Each structure stands twice: as C-alpha cells, then as structure tokens.
Amino acid sequence: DKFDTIHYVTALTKLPGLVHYRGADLVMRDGVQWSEGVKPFWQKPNAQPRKH
RNA sequence: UGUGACCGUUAGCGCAUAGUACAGUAAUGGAAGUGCAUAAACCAAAUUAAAGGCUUAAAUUAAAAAUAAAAUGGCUGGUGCAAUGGCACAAAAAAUAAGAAAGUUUAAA
Numbered sequence: 001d002k003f004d005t006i007h008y009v010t011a012l013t014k015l016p017g018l019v020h021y022r023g024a025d026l027v028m029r030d031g032v033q034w035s036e037g038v039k040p041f042w043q044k045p046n047a048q049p050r051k052h
Numbered sequence: 053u054g055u056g057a058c059c060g061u062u063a064g065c066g067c068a069u070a071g072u073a074c075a076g077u078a079a080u081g082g083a084a085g086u087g088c089a090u091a092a093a094c095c096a097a098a099u100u101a102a103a104g105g106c107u108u109a110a111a112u113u114a115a116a117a118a119u120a121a122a123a124u125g126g127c128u129g130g131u132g133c134a135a136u137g138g139c140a141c142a143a144a145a146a147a148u149a150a151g152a153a154a155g156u157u158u159a160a161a
C-alpha cells in the first residue's frame with residue numbers, strides 16, 4: 001500500500017536485470033572485469049534464462 | 053543415469069524403513085527385527101553279554117535287479133547360499149556472482 005507511480009516504474013525497470021541467464025549459456029573471459037560497456041563474459045546464441 | 057580386487061542382516065546408513073517402540077518434565081537420546089537347512093554350550097535317557105557231534109559221489113544258473121547303524125529326543129539360530137537394502141565418487145542437469153543505482157552494454161543470420 002505504500003507505493004506510488006515512481007515505485008511501480010522502478011520495480012519494472014529493474015526486473016529484467018534480476019532475471020539471470022543459464023551458466024551453461026555463458027562463457028567467461030580471462031581476467032575481464034565489469035566496466036563501461038564491457039562484461040566479463042560473452043553469450044552463446046539464443047541464451048535461455050534460469051529454470052527456477 | 054553410469055562404474056567398483058566397496059558391504060551382504062552383530063556387515064553396509066541409526067533404519068533390507070524407524071527417527072518408529074521405548075527412556076526423559078523438557079531440549080535430547082535411541083533399539084530389536086529377511087528367506088531356507090541334523091552347529092556349540094546346555095538338561096533327561098542309554099552299564100554289563102551267554103551257546104560244543106545228522107550217516108555226504110552226479111546240484112543251480114533267459115538276462116538283469118534285489119540282505120550290513122558313520123548321525124537319540126530337545127532348546128537355540130551360528131555357519132553356508134541369494135538379494136526389491138546400503139557406501140564412494142563419476143556423467144548430465146540444477147543452484148550461484150556482478151561495475152552502476154529511478155537510465156542505455158551481450159544482438160548469430
């Protein structure tokens with residue numbers, strides 16, 4: 001009940017980031033760290049989300 | 053699901069299901085128990101041994117088979133054999149991480 005328009009918008013915009021891909025559909029780069037536009041992994045084609 | 057110079061009912065998980073019966077006010081602790089068959093301890097019964105004189109010369113056999121005490125009655129559940137139970141990891145899958153903070157990245161045709 002303690003929700004406003006901003007609270008609903010923020011929850012929706014952050015939900016996509018809380019859904020993670022399968023560990024079997026990701027390949028880790030060697031020594032790469034999170035940065036501006038760079039991730040420590042690359043995705044295989046048509047990656048699937050976690051089962052649970 | 054896969055494999056074993058891992059176990060085979062005092063073994064292997066506490067459990068061949070049981071965290072049950074039971075102990076405790078409580079937290080808690082925690083069993084026994086598969087199927088078949090002359091094993092042991094254990095209790096009753098079981099002592100001994102005698103025998104002294106028919107006159108003997110022409111049978112039998114398809115074939116085969118058929119005369120001899122290693123072990124009393126019990127109670128108990130070891131040993132031997134088997135597995136609808138356990139132990140260890142392996143393969144596959146699953147779970148899992150973010151830099152930022154109401155803002156943009158990672159998309160194979």
Ligand SMILES: [Mg+2]
Nearest residue numbers: 061129130131
């Ligand atoms: Mg036995």
Ligand SMILES: [Mg+2]
Nearest residue numbers: 061063064067
């Ligand atoms: Mg046992």
